[model samples]
Target: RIELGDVTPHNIKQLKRLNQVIFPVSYNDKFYKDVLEVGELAKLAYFNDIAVGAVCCRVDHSQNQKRLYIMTLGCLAPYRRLGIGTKMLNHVLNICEKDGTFDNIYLHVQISNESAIDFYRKFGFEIIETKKNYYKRIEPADAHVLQKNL
Candidate 1:
């Protein structure tokens, strides 16, 4: 069975490793610094006791409304499409549903990543905008801004 755990300072390396293997972009030190204080907004997924995926998020309180921004959400190649991502997302979704403070949840996906776009769409997220040069160092630069209204 898959188990979800908090990303504490003690085991944060697992999240780092997952990110290194799962993403092409490298996160800055500030990302880890803020993640520790985000409460349940960050989590590591353990599949049968081995870490394999993670989700990191931040709450946005700009533009006269509260919104949840998904900074990263991914699983290792071997663990992809196994509902682990779904579990992590549902964890955040349930928290938002109960808090009732967020107006919506959103994230940016590189234009070439159709698989992730499909995954988010399964949960009611829709592409609301196309951001030009969204990625600083990645090819295609453009990204699809997907949002799910809460």
Candidate 2:
């Protein structure tokens, strides 16, 4: 079974290692530094006590409302299809629901990642916009902005 763990300084390395294997680009030190300050906004997924996936997020202010932005969410290749991702996402969604402060939740996905697009869609995320050249080094360079209104 998969359990969620808090991303504290003590276990931050596990999140770094997981992100390294799951994402193509490297996250900056500022990212991890900011994560330490966001309580419950970042989490590591533990499958049988082994770290296998993670989710990170931030609160954003836009116009007159606040929104939750998913910075990164992914699982180790071998851990896919285990519902770890779903649990992590639902955890964040539940927090937003309880707080009732966010107007919506959103994330970006490379245009080529159909699986991820479909995954978010199943959770009620819609493709709100297409961002061209959103990625620096990726081949597609474009991304789909997916958002789910609260």
Candidate 3:
């Protein structure tokens, strides 16, 4: 079974490496700097004390902010099809539902990533908008902005 754990300053290093291995995209320097502070909002999936997957998120707390954004979700290459991603997502969904802090959960996925799109769709998320040239800079790749209302 997989264990769901919250990311803290102490665990940021491994999770950072996990993110890089799973997501080879170029994230801005801001992430490298404030990850410790914001990383606490992220969750890690551990199997036998090994980091297997992660879901990074952000929740807006101010007025007019009733949203929780799932910025990144990925699993170790060898762990694919093992439901770790689903488990992580379910964990976040449960927290959002219980906290009553968000009216919706949202994410941005690369348009070319059909597998992830299908996975999110199966989990009840729907694409609401298209972000042209929103992803990695070189290709002008498009992105799909998806959301699930709580």
| Candidate 1 residue 79 C-alpha distance from true site, Å | 0.7
Per-candidate local distance difference test: 0.93, 0.93, 0.81
What does candidate 3's lDDT look like per residue over 1-150, in tens digits? 888887776777877888888884856657755555664457889987788888888776543668888878999878888889888889889888788868888888888888999999998999999999886554537889998988
Model 2 lDDT at residue 28: 95
lDDT of 3: 0.81
Q: Mind giving the per-residue lDDT tens digits that candidate 1 earns over 99-143?
A: 998999999999999999999999999999999999888898999
Each model's total of backbone clashes: 0, 0, 0
How displaced is residue 108 in candidate 2, in Å?
A: 0.6
Model 1 worst lDDT run, 10 consecutive residues: 12-21
Candidate 2, which segments miss by more than 4 Å at Cα? none
Q: Write the per-residue lDDT of candidate 2 for residues 56-132, one digit (tens) a residue.
A: 99999986789999999999888898899899999999999999989999899999999899889999999999999
